[PDB]
Amino acid sequence: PCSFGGVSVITPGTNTSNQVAVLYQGVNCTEVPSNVFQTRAGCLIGAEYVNNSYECDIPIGAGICASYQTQSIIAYTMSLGAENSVAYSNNSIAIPTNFTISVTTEILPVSMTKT
Amino acid sequence: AYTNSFTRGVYYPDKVFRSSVLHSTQDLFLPFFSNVTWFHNPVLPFNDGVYFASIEKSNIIRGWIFGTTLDSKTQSLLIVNNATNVVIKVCEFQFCNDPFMESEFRVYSSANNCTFEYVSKNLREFVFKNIDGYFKIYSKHTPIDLPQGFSALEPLVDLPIGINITRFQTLLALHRSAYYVGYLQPRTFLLKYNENGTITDAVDCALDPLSETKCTLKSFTVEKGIYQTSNFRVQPTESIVRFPNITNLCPFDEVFNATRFASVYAWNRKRISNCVADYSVLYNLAPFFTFKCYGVSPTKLNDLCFT
Amino acid sequence: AIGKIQDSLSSALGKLQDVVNHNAQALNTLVKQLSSKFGAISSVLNDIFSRLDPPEAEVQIDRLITGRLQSLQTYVTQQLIRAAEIRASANLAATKMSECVLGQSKRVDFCGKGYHLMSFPQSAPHGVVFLHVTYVPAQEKNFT
Amino acid sequence: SVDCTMYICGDSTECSNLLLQYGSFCTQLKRALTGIAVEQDKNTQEVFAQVKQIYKTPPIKYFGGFNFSQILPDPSKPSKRSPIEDLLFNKVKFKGLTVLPPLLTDEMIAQYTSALLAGTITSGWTFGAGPALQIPFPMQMAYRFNGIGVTQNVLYENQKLIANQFNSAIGKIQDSLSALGKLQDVVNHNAQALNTLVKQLSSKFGAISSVLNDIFSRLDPPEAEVQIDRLITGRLQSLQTYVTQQLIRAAEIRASANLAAT
Amino acid sequence: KMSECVLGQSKRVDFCGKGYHLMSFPQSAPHGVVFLHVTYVPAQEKNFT
Amino acid sequence: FNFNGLKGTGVLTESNKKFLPFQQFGRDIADTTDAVRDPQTLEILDIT
Ligand SMILES: *[C@@H]1O[C@H](CO)[C@@H](O[C@@H]2O[C@H](CO)[C@@H](O)[C@H](O)[C@H]2NC(C)=O)[C@H](O)[C@H]1NC(C)=O
Ligand SMILES: *[C@@H]1O[C@H](CO)[C@@H](O[C@@H]2O[C@H](CO)[C@@H](O)[C@H](O)[C@H]2NC(C)=O)[C@H](O)[C@H]1NC(C)=O
Ligand SMILES: *[C@@H]1O[C@H](CO)[C@@H](O[C@@H]2O[C@H](CO)[C@@H](O)[C@H](O)[C@H]2NC(C)=O)[C@H](O)[C@H]1NC(C)=O
Ligand SMILES: *[C@@H]1O[C@H](CO)[C@@H](O[C@@H]2O[C@H](CO)[C@@H](O)[C@H](O)[C@H]2NC(C)=O)[C@H](O)[C@H]1NC(C)=O
Ligand SMILES: *[C@@H]1O[C@H](CO)[C@@H](O[C@@H]2O[C@H](CO)[C@@H](O)[C@H](O)[C@H]2NC(C)=O)[C@H](O)[C@H]1NC(C)=O
Ligand SMILES: *[C@@H]1O[C@H](CO)[C@@H](O[C@@H]2O[C@H](CO)[C@@H](O)[C@H](O)[C@H]2NC(C)=O)[C@H](O)[C@H]1NC(C)=O
Ligand SMILES: *[C@@H]1O[C@H](CO)[C@@H](O)[C@H](O)[C@H]1NC(C)=O
Ligand SMILES: *[C@@H]1O[C@H](CO)[C@@H](O)[C@H](O)[C@H]1NC(C)=O
Ligand SMILES: *[C@@H]1O[C@H](CO)[C@@H](O)[C@H](O)[C@H]1NC(C)=O
Ligand SMILES: *[C@@H]1O[C@H](CO)[C@@H](O)[C@H](O)[C@H]1NC(C)=O
Ligand SMILES: *[C@@H]1O[C@H](CO)[C@@H](O)[C@H](O)[C@H]1NC(C)=O
Ligand SMILES: *[C@@H]1O[C@H](CO)[C@@H](O)[C@H](O)[C@H]1NC(C)=O
Ligand SMILES: *[C@@H]1O[C@H](CO)[C@@H](O)[C@H](O)[C@H]1NC(C)=O
Ligand SMILES: *[C@@H]1O[C@H](CO)[C@@H](O)[C@H](O)[C@H]1NC(C)=O
Ligand SMILES: *[C@@H]1O[C@H](CO)[C@@H](O)[C@H](O)[C@H]1NC(C)=O
Strands B35-39 and B2-4, how do they pair?
antiparallel
Closest C-alpha among B47, B50, B45, B64 to residue B181? B50
**Residues in chain F, total:** 48
Q: How many CB pairs under 8 A join C and D?
A: 53
CB–CB of B222/B229 below 8 Å? no
CA of C137 to the centre of ligand 2 (A): 14
Three-state secondary structure call for residue E34: strand
Tell me the C-alpha distance between B44 and C140, whole Å.
86
Task: List, chain by chain if needed, residues with CB within 6 Å of any ligand 15 atom.
Answer: B 253, 257, 285
Contact B226 A9 (CB under 8 A): yes
CB–CB of B227/B209 below 8 Å? no
Q: How far does CA D214 lie from the centroid of its chain? A: 41
The residues, any chain, with a CB within 8 Å of residue D37's CB and separated by 6 or more, are D1, D100
The conformational region for residue E19 under phi > 0 = left, psi -120 to 50 = alpha, else beta, is left
Q: How far does CA D206 lie from the centroid of its chain? A: 39
- What is the rounded radius of gyration, in angstroms, for the C-alpha atoms of chain F? 10
Tell me the C-alpha distance between A105 and B7, whole Å.
49
Resolution to one decimal, Å: 3.3
Q: What is the DSSP letter of C102?
A: S
Whether A4 has its CB under 8 Å from any CB of chain D: the answer is yes
Element (H, E) at C64: helix C54-96
CB–CB of F38/F3 below 8 Å? yes
- Residue B162 alpha carbon, nearest atom of ligand 13: 13
Which residues are registered as beta bridge partners of B2? B37
Which residues are registered as beta bridge partners of B139? B126, B154
Breaks (C-N over 2.5 A) in chain C follow: 11
Cβ-count burial of A111 within 10 angstroms (0-12 exposed, 13-18 middle, 19+ buried)? Answer: middle
DSSP chain D: -B-HHHHHT-S-SHHHHHHGGG-SHHHHHHHHHHHHHHHHHHHHHHHH---SSEE---TT--BTTB--TTTS--SSSSS---HHHHHHTT----SSB--PPPSS-HHHHHHHHHHHHHHHHHHTTGGGSSS-----HHHHHHHHHHHTT--THHHHTTHHHHHHHHHHHHHHHHHHH--THHHHHHHHHHHHHHHHHHHTTS--TTSS-S-TTHHHHTS-HHHHHHHHHHHHHHHHHHHHHHHHHHHHHHHHHHHHHHHHH-
* Phi and psi angles of residue A75, each rounded to the nearest 5 degrees, phi first: -120, 160
Cβ-count burial of C99 within 10 angstroms (0-12 exposed, 13-18 middle, 19+ buried)? Answer: buried
Chain D hits for B304, Cβ within 8 Å: 217-218
E strands, A12-92, are 21-25, 36-39, 42-45, 48-49, 58-61, 64-67, 74-77, 83-84
Element (H, E) at E24: strand E20-29
Residue among A98, A101, A103 whose CB has most ligand 2 atoms within 8 A, to mutate? A98
Q: Using the CB atoms, write b or e for C22-52: b if 16+ within 10 Å.
A: ebeebeebbeebbebbbbbeebeeeebeeee
Q: What is the DSSP letter of E2?
A: I
CB–CB of E22/E39 below 8 Å? yes
Question: Is A71 a pocket residue for ligand 7 (Cβ < 6 Å)?
Answer: no
Helices (H) and strands (E) in chain A, counts: 0, 10
Tell me the C-alpha distance between B103 and D74, whole Å.
102
Tell me the C-alpha distance between C116 and D74, whole Å.
38
Q: How far does CA D21 lie from the centroid of its chain? A: 37
In chain E the first and final C-alpha atoms are separated, in Å, by: 40
Q: Tell me the ligand closest to B135's alpha carbon.
A: 13
| Residue to substitute from C91, C92, C95, interface E, most E β-carbons within 10 A | C95
CB–CB of B111/B87 below 8 Å? no
Contact F24 B15 (CB under 8 A): yes
Question: Is F16 a pocket residue for ligand 14 (Cβ < 6 Å)?
Answer: no
Tell me the C-alpha distance between D246 and D192, whole Å.
12
Contact B222 A13 (CB under 8 A): yes
Tell me the C-alpha distance between F42 and F32, whole Å.
21
Chain D hits for C85, Cβ within 8 Å: 251
Tell me the C-alpha distance between D8 and D234, whole Å.
9
Cβ-count burial of B143 within 10 angstroms (0-12 exposed, 13-18 middle, 19+ buried)? Answer: exposed
Closest C-alpha among B121, B153, B112, B115 to residue B136? B153
CB atoms within 10 A of CB D261: 15
Closest C-alpha among D23, D21, D46 to residue D254? D46
The conformational region for residue A62 under phi > 0 = left, psi -120 to 50 = alpha, else beta, is left
If DSSP states are collapsed to H, E and C, what string results for chain B? CEEECCCCCCECCCCCECCCCCEEEEEEECCCCCEEEEECCCCEECCCCEEECEECCCCCEEEEEEECCCCCCCCEEEEEECCCCEEEEEEEEEECCCCCCCCCCCCEEEEEEEEEECCCCEEEEEEEEEECCEEEEEEEEEECCCCCCCCCEEEEEEEECCCCCCEEEEEECCCCCCEEEECCEEEEEEEEECCCCCEEEEEECCCCHHHHHHHHHCCCCCCCEEEEEEEEECCCCCCCCCCCCCCCECCCHHHHCCCCCCCHHHCCCCCCCCCECCHHHCCCCCCCCCCCCCCCCCCCHHHCCCC
CB–CB of B70/B167 below 8 Å? yes
DSSP chain F: -EETTEE--S-EEE------TT--EEE-TTS-EEEEE-TTT--EEEE-
Smallest Cβ–Cβ distance between A88 and the set D41, D49, D58 belongs to D58
CB–CB of D69/D158 below 8 Å? no
Contact A11 B230 (CB under 8 A): no
Distance from CA of A56 to the nearest CA of C (A): 20
Three-state secondary structure call for residue C55: helix
Q: Tell me the ligand closest to B73's alpha carbon.
A: 12
Residue B112 CA: distances (Å) to CA of B77, B104, B109, B115: 12, 20, 10, 9
Q: What is the DSSP letter of A3?
A: -
* Phi and psi angles of residue D152, each rounded to the nearest 5 degrees, phi first: -70, -15
Cβ-count burial of D212 within 10 angstroms (0-12 exposed, 13-18 middle, 19+ buried)? Answer: buried
Closest C-alpha among A8, A10, A12 to residue A68? A12
Distance from CA of A35 to the nearest CA of B (A): 16
Whether F9 has its CB under 8 Å from any CB of chain C: the answer is no
Distance from CA of E10 to the nearest CA of C (A): 12
* Helical axes D25-48 vs D221-261, angle rounded to 10°: 20
Tell me the C-alpha distance between D197 and D29, whole Å.
14
Chain C hits for E11, Cβ within 8 Å: 106
Strands B154-160 and B225-233, how do they pair?
unpaired
Tell me the C-alpha distance between D160 and B306, whole Å.
86
Task: List, chain by chain if needed, residues with CB within 6 Å of any ligand 4 atom.
Answer: D 62, 67, 69-70
Tell me the C-alpha distance between D203 and D193, whole Å.
16
Contact C77 D244 (CB under 8 A): yes
Closest C-alpha among A85, A92, A10 to residue A45? A10
CB atoms within 10 A of CB B109: 10
Chain B hits for A73, Cβ within 8 Å: none
Q: Tell me the ligand closest to C141's alpha carbon.
A: 1
Whether A107 has its CB under 8 Å from any CB of chain D: the answer is no
